[PDB]
Amino acid sequence: MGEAPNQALLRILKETEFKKIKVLGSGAFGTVYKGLWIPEGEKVKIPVAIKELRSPKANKEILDEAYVMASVDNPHVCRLLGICLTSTVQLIMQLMPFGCLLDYVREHKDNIGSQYLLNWCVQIAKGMNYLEDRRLVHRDLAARNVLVKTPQHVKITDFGRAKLLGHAEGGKVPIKWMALESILHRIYTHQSDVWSYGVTVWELMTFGSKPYDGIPASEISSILEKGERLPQPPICTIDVYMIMVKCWMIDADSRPKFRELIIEFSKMARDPQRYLVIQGDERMHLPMDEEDMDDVVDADEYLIP
Amino acid sequence: MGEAPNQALLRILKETEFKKIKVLGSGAFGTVYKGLWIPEGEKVKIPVAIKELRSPKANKEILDEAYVMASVDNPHVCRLLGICLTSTVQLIMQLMPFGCLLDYVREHKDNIGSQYLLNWCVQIAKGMNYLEDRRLVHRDLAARNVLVKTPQHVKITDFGRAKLLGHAEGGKVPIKWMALESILHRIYTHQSDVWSYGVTVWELMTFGSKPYDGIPASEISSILEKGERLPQPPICTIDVYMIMVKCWMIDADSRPKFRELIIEFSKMARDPQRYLVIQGDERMHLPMDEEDMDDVVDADEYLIP
Numbered sequence: 001m002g003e004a005p006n007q008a009l010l011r012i013l014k015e016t017e018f019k020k021i022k023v024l025g026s027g028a029f030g031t032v033y034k035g036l037w038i039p040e041g042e043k044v045k046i047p048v049a050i051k052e053l054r055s056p057k058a059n060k061e062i063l064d065e066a067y068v069m070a071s072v073d074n075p076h077v078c079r080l081l082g083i084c085l086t087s088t089v090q091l092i093m094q095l096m097p098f099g100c101l102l103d104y105v106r107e108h109k110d111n112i113g114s115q116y117l118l119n120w121c122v123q124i125a126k127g128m129n130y131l132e133d134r135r136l137v138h139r140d141l142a143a144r145n146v147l148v149k150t151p152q153h154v155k156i157t158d159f160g161r162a163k164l165l166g167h168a169e170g171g172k173v174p175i176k177w178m179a180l181e182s183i184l185h186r187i188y189t190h191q192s193d194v195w196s197y198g199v200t201v202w203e204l205m206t207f208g209s210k211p212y213d214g215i216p217a218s219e220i221s222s223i224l225e226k227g228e229r230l231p232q233p234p235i236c237t238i239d240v241y242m243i244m245v246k247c248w249m250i251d252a253d254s255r256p257k258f259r260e261l262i263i264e265f266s267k268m269a270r271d272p273q274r275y276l277v278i279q280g281d282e283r284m285h286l287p288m289d290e291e292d293m294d295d296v297v298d299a300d301e302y303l304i305p
Numbered sequence: 306m307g308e309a310p311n312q313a314l315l316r317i318l319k320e321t322e323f324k325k326i327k328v329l330g331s332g333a334f335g336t337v338y339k340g341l342w343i344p345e346g347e348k349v350k351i352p353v354a355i356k357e358l359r360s361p362k363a364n365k366e367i368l369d370e371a372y373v374m375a376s377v378d379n380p381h382v383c384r385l386l387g388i389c390l391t392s393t394v395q396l397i398m399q400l401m402p403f404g405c406l407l408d409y410v411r412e413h414k415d416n417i418g419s420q421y422l423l424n425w426c427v428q429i430a431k432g433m434n435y436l437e438d439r440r441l442v443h444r445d446l447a448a449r450n451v452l453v454k455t456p457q458h459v460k461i462t463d464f465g466r467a468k469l470l471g472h473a474e475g476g477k478v479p480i481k482w483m484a485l486e487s488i489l490h491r492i493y494t495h496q497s498d499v500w501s502y503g504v505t506v507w508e509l510m511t512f513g514s515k516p517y518d519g520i521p522a523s524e525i526s527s528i529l530e531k532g533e534r535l536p537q538p539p540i541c542t543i544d545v546y547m548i549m550v551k552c553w554m555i556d557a558d559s560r561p562k563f564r565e566l567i568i569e570f571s572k573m574a575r576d577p578q579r580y581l582v583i584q585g586d587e588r589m590h591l592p593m594d595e596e597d598m599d600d601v602v603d604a605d606e607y608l609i610p
């Protein structure tokens with residue numbers, strides 16, 4: 001008995017229960033449709049996303065992704081409703097109508113204030129801390145893989161590279177989000193996800209800029225070994241940028257834990273304009289003792305293992 | 306092996322880590338203080354409530370309550386941070402600054418709109434559905450035992466009468482919230498908590514009225530056997546009152562499950578003024594295809610066992 005038994009339920013959903021299916025997009029990730037799941041004998045209509053990878057090799061890797069998603073349950077992690085057994089296997093997930101966070105921050109950069117930016121950092125850190133408690137290394141954390149249910153509520157998605165108990169084989173990888181030890185030695189831990197979280201925060205604070213724009217992926221390892229890092233965003237205070245820099249330390253144990261990031265960003269979220277300087281932050285719209293106030297943290301943001 | 310092992314952690318917290326302790330109130334429940342928990346070697350201050358029952362018999366029943374609270378983890382259920390081993394044992398919980406929901410609805414009745422009322426019904430149902438998955442019967446669900454973290458966020462509290470695997474002994478009980486089978490035969494199930502949920506919803510919709518006001522507790526059993534129930538609140542539509550009436554059925558299996566109540570109230574929460582008629586509902590302030598819209602439910606409100 002090395003590990004406890006996984007008693008998660010894999011729901012097999014009938015093809016006849018799905019209606020109004022339309023394509024949202026496609027690429028290397030595969031194909032994602034939007035649809036309407038109507039369970040039989042229940043007056044309920046559930047907006048769902050339906051994912052197909054781009055047959056034996058496709059079904060193996062997609063069912064590995066279904067295994068991980070069926071095993072997780074957290075408000076800031078994406079929910080698998082079930083799978084549909086067609087010729088190629090389909091993952092049925094909750095619909096996140098506003099899309100990925102990277103596209104959201106690019107499209108609404110003029111209406112995104114410091115409160116929303118800092119709240120997203122807290123929610124992403126809460127999702128990743130949950131994944132650490134479940135002993136999962138995500139290995140693909142980026143702004144593209146954070147989905148927006150509403151502007152106030154984001155969730156982590158895409159568990160295609162996810163692995164239990166945080167050495168990987170060779171393949172096609174997101175070099176620009178990876179820790180230096182992951183690029184050189186193929187070592188992946190929870191602390192390598194913290195590096196990726198730092199890069200994800202930098203994406204949001206720059207309003208969806210590409211990290212190391214122009215630089216090819218092969219040159220990134222040598223750039224990071226020389227001590228170069230992503231530059232300070234215009235809106236970021238030294239306080240916020242110091243947290244990103246701490247995520248990009250060479251020593252993995254020197255980096256902050258996700259529980260510490262939850263605490264630190266939630267303090268900043270109580271006084272957002274002290275930590276992010278955004279032009280026109282007041283009119284942004286999207287659809288106790290004084291001495292104590294600085295170091296105050298709510299119990300819901302102070303997470304015990 | 307009848308039941309799985311409970312691997313929950315009981316944190317023992319030092320008396321020297323608590324500061325600024327002030328009394329909030331006292332009664333039959335015991336005494337509740339507000340305070341500030343400062344963990345040693347961490348720059349963090351956590352607002353906490355500290356509960357003491359009103360010594361061997363007091364320590365036994367309070368540690369039974371600590372056992373249940375240490376075992377639960379849900380956003381709509383109250384969080385135990387730990388216990389403090391003084392002469393009489395103290396439960397350390399998260400602070401809920403706005404107090405209990407019963408007192409909140411009485412104090413702010415002029416500023417409470419249909420959106421908040423229906424959202425509270427959903428959140429309470431989510432907390433109770435979680436407790437059903439954990440095989441806990443609360444046995445004391447009422448507006449007094451729902452605490453307000455913020456006006457947008459409520460949690461269930463007080464597990465002094467909580468019991469595992471849903472026959473009780475004789476004692477002092479909340480007769481006016483109990484199911485008829487619990488009053489007559491001392492039978493307690495998850496379906497007896499649904500009756501109490503119905504009475505809790507009636508408390509909110511009447512803005513904190515006392516149920517069966519004037520009637521003594523001994524006469525309640527005979528009143529319910531005759532078919533009498535709590536009357537329809539002025540603000541309630543027939544739709545909302547039908548859900549309360551369904552909670553008060555004689556047959557426990559005919560009552561709705563908590564997962565069904567989550568679904569039904571969340572549909573109503575999308576169009577609140579169709580289901581609750583409140584004078585001046587528009588200016589209340591507290592600190593897709595058209596054919597589908599009626600039966601639409603988000604995946605987060607469609608809870609699978």
Ligand SMILES: */C=C/C(=O)N1CCC2(CC1)CNC(=O)c1cc(-c3ccnc(-c4cccc(OC)c4)n3)[nH]c12
Nearest residue numbers: 024029032034049094095096097099100103144157158
């Ligand atoms: C913006 C990044 C992007 O385009 N990606 C990365 C995520 C992507 C799709 C390509 C690939 N991998 C996933 O795991 C995944 C899941 C989803 C997804 C799930 C649910 N809902 C949506 C969605 C997107 C846009 C609009 C709507 O509503 C109409 C819904 N997407 N996407 C991905």
Ligand SMILES: */C=C/C(=O)N1CCC2(CC1)CNC(=O)c1cc(-c3ccnc(-c4cccc(OC)c4)n3)[nH]c12
Nearest residue numbers: 329334337339354399400401402404405408449462463
């Ligand atoms: C309004 C009902 C009431 O007064 N009660 C019932 C709940 C009560 C106190 C008496 C007894 N049992 C409990 O389990 C419990 C827990 C709390 C509680 C926990 C955390 N914070 C508070 C609180 C109340 C009022 C104001 C503040 O902030 C200053 C905090 N209460 N209360 C109870």
